[PDB]
UniProtKB/Swiss-Prot annotation:
Localization in the cell: Secreted
Protein's organism: Sarocladium strictum (Black bundle disease fungus)
Protein name: Glucooligosaccharide oxidase
Uppermost EC category: oxidoreductase
Modification comment: The FAD cofactor is bound via a bicovalent 6-S-cysteinyl, 8alpha-N1-histidyl FAD linkage.
Cofactor note: Binds 1 FAD per subunit in a bicovalent manner.
Effect of residue 74 to A/S/C/Y: Does not abolish the covalent FAD linkage and has little effect on the Km, but significantly reduced kcat values 50- to 600-fold. Abolishes FAD binding
Residues that, per the record, bind substrate: 76, 133, 249, 357, 388, 433
A GO MF label: metal ion binding
Transmembrane segments: none
Main location class: secreted
Pfam families, alphabetized: BBE, FAD_binding_4
Length: 479
């Protein structure tokens, strides 16, 4: 029943499922993935249809609270909760239907996750989509912020395949969006992050699951000087040579730097591409993984222990602080400073660990870069690099130190080594790899850069009262 919760009373009246705060359902869906930023929602609705979403939004309006859609709950700032206490949460993971038609167009409900989605696309016509590695990630949050992975260099962002959607607006209206209908909102949904509308169903174009994919890894044994020379070589290569069908990211930690990625082709061809750059990068490295497989195979290569088929039964958690950055080609100062930081300022206590991913995001032959900053809300098409910084506390159940008090300075300083060298307008961050220490003003500029003003105008049109806003989302500001 709706004891002590007027919103639950409204939801019950609308025949919309909800979680009582004293329930196990609340324990699961009301507890953020990142326990460092767990929040307490005002209520939790569990819509099962587009109409249910609209009814729930109306209930939130009646209550005078902000409303946050939660897809897979993998946002680093817990934006499925609104990024703070007190929002009406719409847990969408019960809405995960995936259907591929005879035109190879896939309809995917707003609460579907990557793993389940990938499986369904394969089962339904051997189709594929360009998306991240984590099977638990919600398609919703993923596409709204971009959707980056080992298929991005070859097939762009997840949002580059979106052709339409059925969404619920802040006034509880239900509309369809596409490049030809409510095109401004469609543009905003493709990269604008959260707060524009609540998506009930996404419509995606798809590509045929590749017949062959070669996954690889290069393990280096580089000292400080070699790190710098290697990164400089990889940068020139990334910008002028790296082939369309190859993806790469560098996995970096206190004692290693490994290259890894997928190649939409065979192993023999891949080795002919890697050999030259391995030599140019200064040697001192070797291929540590090189195997041909298929789409299903590559997906299962980057699960890292996570279950592949996840729907509404999800209760995984971590305790960490993350950050990100996007940037153009770097000068020697940025590279040298980054390397110096790894060697001289990355010592952490036992129980704490960190890693960084240096993503080959843009470049001449990157499909992502084949789209201009004006074509979708994604605003980093001009950036060659994307980075993810991850600061984990493994024994968080026993000790979270230095968090929650401090610790942020470690990765903030790591980001600064590179960011400080960039012109103000080129400084960016990737919303899908959120930095919780940012203010709403700072976040908007870093996450959406040159597209922020347009996004704010679109936000003003579709959600003037900021009903769907979170603590760092685009604000309603008309031009
Ligand atoms: C935990 C985790 C995150 C990952 C992982 N791997 C990634 C990868 O390989 N590539 C990436 O580009 N990103 C990866 N991420 C980062 C992010 O967690 C994701 O990219 C997504 O942002 C997460 O989506 P989701 O799980 O849906 O996040 P929520 O916290 O539920 O919401 C995020 C956000 O956007 C809104 N939103 C979600 N769903 C909807 C719908 N249907 N309609 C409207 N708005 C929606 C929220 O309101 C909020 O603002 C790997 C791992 C393990
Ligand atoms: C994934 O789990 C769902 C449960 O909702 C099930 O319906 C589906 O068949 C599973 N897919 C598999 C095992 O490929
Ligand atoms: C990084 O470590 C060096 C030690 O050589 C030190 O001089 C510098 O101040 C440190 N920078 C910080 C605190 O981020
Ligand atoms: Zn009760
Ligand atoms: Zn509470
Ligand atoms: Zn080629
Ligand atoms: Zn400088």
């Amino acid at each position: 029943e709706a004891e002590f919760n007027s919103i639950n009373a409204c939801l019950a009246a609308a025949d919309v499922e909800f979680h009582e705060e004293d329930s196990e359902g609340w324990d699961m869906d009301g507890t953020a993935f990142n326990l460092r930023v767990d929040y307490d929602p005002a209520a939790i609705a569990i819509p099962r249809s587009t109409e249910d979403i609209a009814a729930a939004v109306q209930c939130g309006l009646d209550a005078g609270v902000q409303i946050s859609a939660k897809g897979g709950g993998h946002s680093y700032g817990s934006y499925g909760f609104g990024g703070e206490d007190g929002h009406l949460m719409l847990e969408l993971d019960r809405m995960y239907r995936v259907s591929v038609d005879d035109n190879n167009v896939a309809t995917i409900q707003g609460g579907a996750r990557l793993g389940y989605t990938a499986l369904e696309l394969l089962d339904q016509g051997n189709r594929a989509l360009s998306h991240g590695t984590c099977p638990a990630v919600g398609v919703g949050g993923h596409v709204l912020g971009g959707g980056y992975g080992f298929a991005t260099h070859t097939h762009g962002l997840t949002l580059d395949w979106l052709i339409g959607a059925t969404v619920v607006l802040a006034d509880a209206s239900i509309v369809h969006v596409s490049e030809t209908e409510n095109a401004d909102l469609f543009w905003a949904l493709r990269g604008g992050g959260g707060g524009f509308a609540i998506v009930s169903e996404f419509e995606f174009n798809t590509f045929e699951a590749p017949e062959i994919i070669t996954t690889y890894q290069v393990t280096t044994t580089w000292n400080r000087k070699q790190h710098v020379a290697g990164l400089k070589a990889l940068q020139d290569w990334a910008q002028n040579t790296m082939p369309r069908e190859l993806s790469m990211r560098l996995e970096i930690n206190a004692n290693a730097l490994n290259w890894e990625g997928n190649f939409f082709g065979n192993a023999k061809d891949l080795k002919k591409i890697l050999q030259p750059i391995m030599k140019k990068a200064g040697g001192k490295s070797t291929i540590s993984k090189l195997v041909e497989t298929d789409w299903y195979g590559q997906i299962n290569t980057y699960l890292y222990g996570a279950d592949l088929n996840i729907t509404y039964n999800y209760d995984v958690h971590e305790y960490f602080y993350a950050n990100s950055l996007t940037a153009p080609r770097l000068s020697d100062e940025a590279i040298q400073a980054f390397v110096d930081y790894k060697f001289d300022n990355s010592s952490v206590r036992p129980g704490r660990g960190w890693w960084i991913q240096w993503d080959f995001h843009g470049g001449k032959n990157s499909a992502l870069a084949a789209v201009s900053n004006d074509e979708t809300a994604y605003a980093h098409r001009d950036q060659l690099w994307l980075w993810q910084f991850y600061d984990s506390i493994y024994d968080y159940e026993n000790n979270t130190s230095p968090y929650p008090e401090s610790g942020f300075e470690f990765m903030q300083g790591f980001v600064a080594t590179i960011e400080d060298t960039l012109p103000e307008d080129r400084k960016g961050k990737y919303f899908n790899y959120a930095d919780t220490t940012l203010t709403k003003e700072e976040a908007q500029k870093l996450y959406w850069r040159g597209n922020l003003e347009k996004l704010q105008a679109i936000k003003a049109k579709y959600d003037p009262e900021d009903v769907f806003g979170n603590v760092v989302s685009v604000e309603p500001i008309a031009y």
